[PDB]
Design an enzyme around this catalytic site. Sequence first.
Site, PDB file in Angstrom:
ATOM      1  N   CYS B 102     -18.809 -77.004  41.998  1.00 47.07           N
ATOM      2  CA  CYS B 102     -19.227 -78.348  41.538  1.00 47.07           C
ATOM      3  C   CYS B 102     -18.360 -78.943  40.441  1.00 47.07           C
ATOM      4  O   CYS B 102     -17.245 -79.338  40.741  1.00 47.07           O
ATOM      5  CB  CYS B 102     -20.715 -78.226  41.331  1.00 47.07           C
ATOM      6  SG  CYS B 102     -21.568 -79.802  41.019  1.00 47.07           S
ATOM      7  N   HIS B 103     -18.872 -79.100  39.220  1.00 46.18           N
ATOM      8  CA  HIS B 103     -18.051 -79.562  38.084  1.00 46.18           C
ATOM      9  C   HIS B 103     -17.262 -78.432  37.450  1.00 46.18           C
ATOM     10  O   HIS B 103     -16.388 -78.702  36.625  1.00 46.18           O
ATOM     11  CB  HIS B 103     -18.895 -80.287  37.033  1.00 46.18           C
ATOM     12  CG  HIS B 103     -19.275 -81.679  37.417  1.00 46.18           C
ATOM     13  ND1 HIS B 103     -20.299 -81.963  38.296  1.00 46.18           N
ATOM     14  CD2 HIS B 103     -18.743 -82.875  37.059  1.00 46.18           C
ATOM     15  CE1 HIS B 103     -20.420 -83.275  38.410  1.00 46.18           C
ATOM     16  NE2 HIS B 103     -19.480 -83.853  37.686  1.00 46.18           N
TER      17      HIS B 103
END
Lengths: 349, 337
Positions: B102-103
């Site tokens: 994800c991030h």
Amino acid sequence: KKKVAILIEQAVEDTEFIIPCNGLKQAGFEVVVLGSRMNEKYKGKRGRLSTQADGTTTEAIASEFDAVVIPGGMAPDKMRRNPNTVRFVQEAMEQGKLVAAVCHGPQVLIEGDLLRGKQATGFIAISKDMMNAGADYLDEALVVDGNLITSREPGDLAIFTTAILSRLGYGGALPDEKDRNAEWWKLADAWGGSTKGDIVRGLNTALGGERYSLEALEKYTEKESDVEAKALFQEMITNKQRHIEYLETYLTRLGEKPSLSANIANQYAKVKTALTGSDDIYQIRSALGDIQTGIGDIGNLCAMYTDPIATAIFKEIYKDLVKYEQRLVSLYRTRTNATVQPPKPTTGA
Amino acid sequence: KKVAILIEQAVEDTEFIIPCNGLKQAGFEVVVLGSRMNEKYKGKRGRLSTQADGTTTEAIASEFDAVVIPGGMAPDKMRRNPNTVRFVQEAMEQGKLVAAVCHGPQVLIEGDLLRGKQATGFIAISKDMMNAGADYLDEALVVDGNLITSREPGDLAIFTTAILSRLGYGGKDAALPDEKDRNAEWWKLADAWGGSTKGDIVRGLNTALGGERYSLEALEKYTEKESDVEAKALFQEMITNKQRHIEYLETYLTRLGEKPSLSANDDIYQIRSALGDIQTGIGDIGNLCAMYTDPIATAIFKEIYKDLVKYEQRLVSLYRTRTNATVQPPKPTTGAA
């Protein structure tokens, strides 16, 4: 009457929307809040801001606006995924309209590929992304590059807003953005940011943490028989005393009598008298834990106030704490003849 | 075999939990590395609350076989910790498995570790990864040497399986599927590792389904009352599209053991209304895309999302043309006779 768009999405840094909004409204400009959709109550990350949009970036016409304001927080992470918002900002930039972004706001500019060769600033967390997007990243309160205005954090909101207003033909009663002595926090306060009380409360949190760590370090130094660890601790005591002076100087300017108040309270007297033993390595673990507490607490204070001066003090303290963390962990490694135990903080956040 | 899982405030809960449980269930020693001790790290969704076992300041990368970097908003804080950035750079240089979801890749950007690497991450940071020199791929799992990346909670079972495989783990009392297995029921692995339950996934599907049914009924009313031929044609096409969306949702609900059919469920103005409905859809369905640990439900929501965004552009271009064709000042009218 000049028309200005303020972009919004969920979890926007509250003051980054609030200050420009009130600054623009107080100046007599029409503010249009542009979200992703109508009938959604947009909430600021700190829960102070709550508002619905006046329009959407889907139907908004860039040519109608004199300026577009892009606030930060975690809102830009969502704004950049909206192709209409990206399009709207690209059209505003292309047409010579003022584009003003603060904090994480430049992520929208990154998404539109609008930073190639631009001199700009933004929150330190996104600085490498800005540079990778081709920006000449500066650590400045304000960077103006033609129609692009950028700032870093809530502490810069007063100057950020002043720069927008002046370029919209409203410089009144307002200091010049190059004014080296302007009391910026007062402008932010008038526009809905931190009160004097808020700023003093924050300074007091930092000051209390430093006073605590000073008492702990003096206790650690006399317990540390080792001459080198003792030397590092004494150097850190000097640093704490320096931070305490800065905080007291600024608190005094804001109408406080911090030395008197501290003498009256005597809140940290039981830190020296509390028994803990004198293991050389244990003092180092304690000091390392205390410095990590400071990094966390002071780190948080750096983004909490709309005063650039208080903000600058917190950033200076943060910078020094990070430097000493590296010095303690180095010392700690060398003394321990085994797997090093984690840092052991002596107080809570 | 020792594995580090990085943590910070507002981590996407499952992106920490699934890898943590998978690695612990596989018999690996998992060390949770935060920025400091005695800080309760809380997940973005309020489910995860844990203290660190150690910090990135004193941790030594050479001691770990792998480092896992979860996402949410945690990487925005991890990338500001120089000890964390350094620890990840060292793990990378040393050829330890570095797995980011994800991030999480934001920490790799901060260490300048993506230049010419094939990788993925959350779509929101895809341009940041590309500007950092990554060959960004929109795929569930991208592996480039010792770098493992994934995009979102829907990819957690494959992400975790890939990590385990490269640590020499293939299952407890049953073989874990190959990461290249086109048929694997990945959501069930995610569920076993603390992710979305069947009930959770069914609820998400029902949320999308309710919204699509509402917008379909709205489109049927608009198309009936629209006199503009070009707009009416757009609405009929959107109706076809919504029916296909409903089919996908119902067919998948049926695969999960539900039985959807058993439960009960001027011209410029209509374009304006359709646009408002689609913007609601984009927000509601967009939210669902990051909420569940089933790659199939996630894929359906993303397909609906893509289609909604595509139709929003068509609706707005038509709205613009109709607005521009509107004569100003308008001609005056009267009542009958």
